[PDB]
Structure 1
Amino acid sequence: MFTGSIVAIVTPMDEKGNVCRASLKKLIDYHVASGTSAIVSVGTTGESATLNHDEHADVVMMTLDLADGRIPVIAGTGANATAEAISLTQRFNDSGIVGCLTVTPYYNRPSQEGLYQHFKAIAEHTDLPQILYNVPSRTGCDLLPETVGRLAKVKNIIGIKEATGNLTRVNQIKELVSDDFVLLSGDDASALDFMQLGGHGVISVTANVAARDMAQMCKLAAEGHFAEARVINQRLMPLHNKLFVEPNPIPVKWACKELGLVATDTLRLPMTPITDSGRETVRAALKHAGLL
């Protein structure tokens, strides 16, 4: 559902840069078998940036189709134009998705009032649950706790993917919102800390390749067994860091390929193939994780 280990799933491509269905199916089967709570489809790790909205929609539909009710699917729906965000959302009305992950507008750097108006308008024109998404390092702006608090009063704004890696934000946000509001980490390396502070889960890059460990860890964290969760986390930590040694999803797509989870590690420009140096850092991380 909207807690636990949620995978920010790669969009597996062939050598032409087109979605590879066979590979997506394997990945979905892998997640159903590994205890992953939900799949975020065509988020950042999903290369939302370089799929056009038609392809973005296909991949979501294909993901849902392959999932076949076995695992909930959340659609990435973010756009830096509110009209575009709205209109992309409509595309997934009645699709079967359980909700949407919607990023703060990138590049144009709106005010807090602007972010409020953006997200309120989007929530207005759908019945689907909305997860807010904050990642200033990508977007150039920062959705502050106060504004999260105003937006949480809207019926179908139900949570936030907090990707700052600033852990003070957990309780600043939490004080300000009801206990039903979901607090999910968007930063693998600090996600166990995030959960220990009161977070409910993680929308994860690491889960693409360490699905089971991430699921166990997140469940331990929810039960208060932090010591036990850390042991897993310790072992995943090089992966938490080195999946970003080169721009996400370059490392993780290579990792999937190396595990045999996807046929090719192809991406679309401006993402470029992994360097040999990166190959060697990632492979070492995988082995530390015990995955290789």
Structure 2
Amino acid sequence: MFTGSIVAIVTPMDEKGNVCRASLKKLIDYHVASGTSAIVSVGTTGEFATLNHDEHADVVMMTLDLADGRIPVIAGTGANATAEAISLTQRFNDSGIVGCLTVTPYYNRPSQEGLYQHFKAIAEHTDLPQILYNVPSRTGCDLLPETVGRLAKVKNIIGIKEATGNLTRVNQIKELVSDDFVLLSGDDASALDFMQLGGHGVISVTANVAARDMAQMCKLAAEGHFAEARVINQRLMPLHNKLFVEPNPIPVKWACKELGLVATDTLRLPMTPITDSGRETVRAALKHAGLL
């Protein structure tokens, strides 16, 4: 499923930084009960940077096993080296995932032509649908609409998670791609705006703790009921912002612990524990959203 509210799920960890199966099960059951459309496993929010390839694959497989066919799983498969991305993609072929979320290479700042070649090569070596992920604030590069239009001609490149927060991108990309290419926000604070302009859903951090309100917001938006959706959005807005008061996923993991959805808020270095001021800010945002 590549529309509506899609959660970029946390990778819950025990105190040693290893994946907590019991906590993940609780999250997945929560998303199944709450109407989330799909689960992005080991995206940014899932700490892809700090899991090695084997651990990363283990988390995706554990998420599929636990989902048990009740909700679709999309795997994070991005890398900044094209061979690495291909390799990681092969590990998931015939796994049961419905598609992959593949980020623009980070740190090395490839050209637009390099991005085209990167993603083209990855798509060539799988039959899985691929969702491109643009987030320049993290990567140092910006996959522009022109290049997205070029890539959308590749049969299995089927959408984009656009995390610039620059809402002009929605219709710049839309006019260059076919009607069935999926435009998904990757920026919760501007996501409703993104859907109002023509976007098809959101790959959401906020969905980790407000799954039902997110799912209803995105449905109302898809039906054109923007004023109604905006009422929900306004109650979620402090959380959309304050989940970034310290680096993601530090706040959202604390929030999930505070609601009882995960056993511990542990992360891997260089992510560090939430500050006391951050706990206070995040808690106030949860209360504004009606969640505590």
What is the TM-score when the length of structure 2 is the normalising length?
A: 1.00
Write the distance in 1 (CA, Å) between the matches of 2:42 and 2:252: 15
How far 1:118 moved relative to its partner?
A: 0.1
Match of residue 201 from structure 1:
201
Please give the per-residue CA displacement for 1:140-195, whole angstroms capped at 9, x wherever unaligned: 00000000000000000000000000000000000000000000000000000000
Write the distance in 2 (CA, Å) between the matches of 1:79 and 1:44: 12
What 5-or-longer segments of structure 1 have no aligned partner? none
1:218 match: secondary structure: helix
1:245 match: secondary structure: coil
How far 1:120 moved relative to its partner?
A: 0.1
Please give the per-residue CA displacement for 1:1-54, whole angstroms capped at 9, x wherever unaligned: 000000000000000000000000000000000000000000000000000000
Match of residue 68 from structure 1:
68
Write the distance in 2 (CA, Å) between the matches of 1:200 and 1:41: 20
Report the number of matched residues. 292
Percent pairwise identity: 100
Write the distance in 2 (CA, Å) between the matches of 1:83 and 1:10: 26
How far 1:71 moved relative to its partner?
A: 0.1
1:133 match: secondary structure: strand
Q: Which runs of 4+ in 1 moved over 6 A?
A: none
Write the distance in 1 (CA, Å) between the matches of 2:207 and 2:125: 32
How far 1:223 moved relative to its partner?
A: 0.0
How far 1:271 moved relative to its partner?
A: 0.1
How far 1:268 moved relative to its partner?
A: 0.2
Please give the per-residue CA displacement for 1:173-224, whole angstroms capped at 9, x wherever unaligned: 0000000000000000000000000000000000000000000000000000
How far 1:105 moved relative to its partner?
A: 0.2
1:147 match: secondary structure: helix
Write the distance in 1 (CA, Å) between the matches of 2:233 and 2:179: 26
Q: Answer yes or no: is 1:139 the counterpart of 2:139.
A: yes
Write the distance in 1 (CA, Å) between the matches of 2:78 and 2:270: 19
Write the distance in 1 (CA, Å) between the matches of 2:281 and 2:179: 40
Write the distance in 1 (CA, Å) between the matches of 2:10 and 2:32: 15
How far 1:251 moved relative to its partner?
A: 0.1
Write the distance in 1 (CA, Å) between the matches of 2:51 and 2:4: 27
Write the distance in 2 (CA, Å) between the matches of 1:171 and 1:182: 12
Match of residue 39 from structure 1:
39
Match of residue 277 from structure 2:
277
Please give the per-residue CA displacement for 1:82-105, whole angstroms capped at 9, x wherever unaligned: 000001000000000000000000
Please give the per-residue CA displacement for 1:242-265, whole angstroms capped at 9, x wherever unaligned: 000000000000000000000000
Write the distance in 2 (CA, Å) between the matches of 1:30 and 1:76: 21
1:101 match: secondary structure: strand
What is the TM-score when the length of structure 1 is the normalising length?
A: 1.00
1:5 match: secondary structure: strand
What 5-or-longer segments of structure 2 have no aligned partner? none
Match of residue 169 from structure 1:
169
Write the distance in 1 (CA, Å) between the matches of 2:273 and 2:179: 43
2:126 match: secondary structure: coil
Match of residue 261 from structure 1:
261
2:93 match: secondary structure: coil
1:113-152 to 2 correspondence within 5 Å? 113-152=113-152
1:191 match: secondary structure: helix
Write the distance in 2 (CA, Å) between the matches of 1:65 and 1:290: 32
Write the distance in 2 (CA, Å) between the matches of 1:91 and 1:147: 27
Write the distance in 2 (CA, Å) between the matches of 1:49 and 1:188: 21
Write the distance in 2 (CA, Å) between the matches of 1:139 and 1:176: 24
1:100 match: secondary structure: strand
1:1-292 to 2 correspondence within 5 Å? 1-292=1-292
Write the distance in 2 (CA, Å) between the matches of 1:64 and 1:239: 28
Please give the per-residue CA displacement for 1:90-136, whole angstroms capped at 9, x wherever unaligned: 00000000000000000000000000000000000000000000000
Write the distance in 2 (CA, Å) between the matches of 1:88 and 1:12: 21
How far 1:291 moved relative to its partner?
A: 0.1
